[PDB]
Amino acid sequence: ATVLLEVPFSARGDRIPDAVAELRTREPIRKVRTITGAEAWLVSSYALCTQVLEDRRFSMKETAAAGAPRLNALTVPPEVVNNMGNIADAGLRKAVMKAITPKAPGLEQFLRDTANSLLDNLITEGAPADLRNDFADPLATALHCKVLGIPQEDGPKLFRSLSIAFMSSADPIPAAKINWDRDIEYMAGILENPNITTGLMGELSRLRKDPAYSHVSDELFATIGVTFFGAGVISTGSFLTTALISLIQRPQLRNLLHEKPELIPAGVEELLRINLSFADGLPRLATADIQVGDVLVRKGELVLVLLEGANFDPEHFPNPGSIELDRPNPTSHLAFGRGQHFCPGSALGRRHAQIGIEALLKKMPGVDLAVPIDQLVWRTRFQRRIPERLPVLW
Numbered sequence: 001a002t003v004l005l006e007v008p009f010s011a012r013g014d015r016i017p018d019a020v021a022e023l024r025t026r027e028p029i030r031k032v033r034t035i036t037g038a039e040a041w042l043v044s045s046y047a048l049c050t051q052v053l054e055d056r057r058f059s060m061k062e063t064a065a066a067g068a069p070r071l072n073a074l075t076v077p078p079e080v081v082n083n084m085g086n087i088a089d090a091g092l093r094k095a096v097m098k099a100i101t102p103k104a105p106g107l108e109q110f111l112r113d114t115a116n117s118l119l120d121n122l123i124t125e126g127a128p129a130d131l132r133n134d135f136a137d138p139l140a141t142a143l144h145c146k147v148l149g150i151p152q153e154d155g156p157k158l159f160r161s162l163s164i165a166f167m168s169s170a171d172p173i174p175a176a177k178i179n180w181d182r183d184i185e186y187m188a189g190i191l192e193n194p195n196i197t198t199g200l201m202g203e204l205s206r207l208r209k210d211p212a213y214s215h216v217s218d219e220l221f222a223t224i225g226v227t228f229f230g231a232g233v234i235s236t237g238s239f240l241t242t243a244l245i246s247l248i249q250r251p252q253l254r255n256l257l258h259e260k261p262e263l264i265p266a267g268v269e270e271l272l273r274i275n276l277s278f279a280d281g282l283p284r285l286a287t288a289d290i291q292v293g294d295v296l297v298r299k300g301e302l303v304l305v306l307l308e309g310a311n312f313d314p315e316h317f318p319n320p321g322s323i324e325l326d327r328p329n330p331t332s333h334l335a336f337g338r339g340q341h342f343c344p345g346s347a348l349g350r351r352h353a354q355i356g357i358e359a360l361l362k363k364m365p366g367v368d369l370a371v372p373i374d375q376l377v378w379r380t381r382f383q384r385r386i387p388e389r390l391p392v393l394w
């Protein structure tokens, strides 16, 4: 006898398991067991993943309901599982979007200058260099301090909460609450700090004192700062790191992007499509009985939308494992989700990766792994797939 198939399949972010194509072909919606012991429906075809993400009756907020089957333990207060809904209800959605666009004056120049300075430092130190800890993650942290309007010197400590805040654990994490409460206290102090007048926190600080937002809670204003720093830094740092592995393993593509940097945006869109940075399916709780393919999902059940199931589906993306810069449907992947919860930071995430890759290819055109690829250490029981160190030479 065997136990029910368990998720996730592998923490490795450099290869897709053969199991994904097997499930997609044979049972694109099927039952699995998560790390908490709950059962869930794993959805792995592009058609069914889109159907779940576009039907609001599959709710993100309701995954925090007491007694629900869980993917993992919460690392935030349950009301934060409704974060974007709370922001929208507060009338803050437009202001938050405007503050996180990469089009802000001098932001792209700041990204280029920061990437170039980090790379010059690595070149001075000499090979091997760690592209995660000494490139992708500090570039993400510096970008988010600038977008938030907070001091660059405060970034590293806020960043150190993330190895715990984005864990995918069977059980509650005592350290996640200690860091959450401290990071909220920091952002509450930022709202009260007269020197913070730019970026997202400068704008929220002004709206907080505007009569049209007098009843928005101080809890929400501080929560927006913690959550946008955390989700943005973990997502951009982890995507850039794993996209750099995808590129280093494709020297013909690396050479083409070095020669024709105008192709970098199309290259980043394909690097997003084949990305394995999300370690778990996106979770939703059914709020009604809903037919999904051959399964009638019942009210109260957990559904997991496997992004790589959709993004490597050959019925939507022919020769899915190949980076092809001339696809006719290039942005139709699900790397930023779909529907109500579509990533609000998509343009910023695209720009961070494009500028990071452009700077790396200019400075280190001969970039290559300095260790055999199997020697990368993949972080386990985490919401992202990332190597602990990314050692390169050039």
Ligand code: HEM
Pocket (backbone or CB within 6 Å): 060, 084, 085, 100, 227, 228, 229, 231, 232, 233, 235, 236, 239, 240, 282, 283, 334, 335, 336, 337, 338, 340, 341, 342, 343, 344, 345, 346, 348, 349, 350
């Ligand atoms: C390469 C970069 C990024 C990737 C791949 C990424 C991916 C995603 C995905 C797949 C979702 C949907 C989650 C779901 O439906 O359950 C999402 C949501 C979100 N992302 Fe991003 N993200 C990235 C960058 C960012 C940045 C830069 C920020 C903010 C500065 C951000 C903030 C958020 C937030 C707050 C949500 C929740 C939205 C909602 O629930 O409506 N993301 N992201």
Ligand SMILES: O=C1N[C@@H](Cc2ccc(O)c(O)c2)C(=O)N[C@H]1Cc1ccc(O)cc1
Pocket (backbone or CB within 6 Å): 060, 075, 076, 080, 081, 082, 083, 084, 165, 166, 226, 227, 228, 230, 231
């Ligand atoms: O539960 C949520 N949390 C936050 C994202 C977030 C920010 C900081 C953290 O320490 C964390 O673990 C998760 C949110 O905006 N919306 C919801 C849904 C969500 C979860 C994860 C994610 O990557 C994006 C959104």
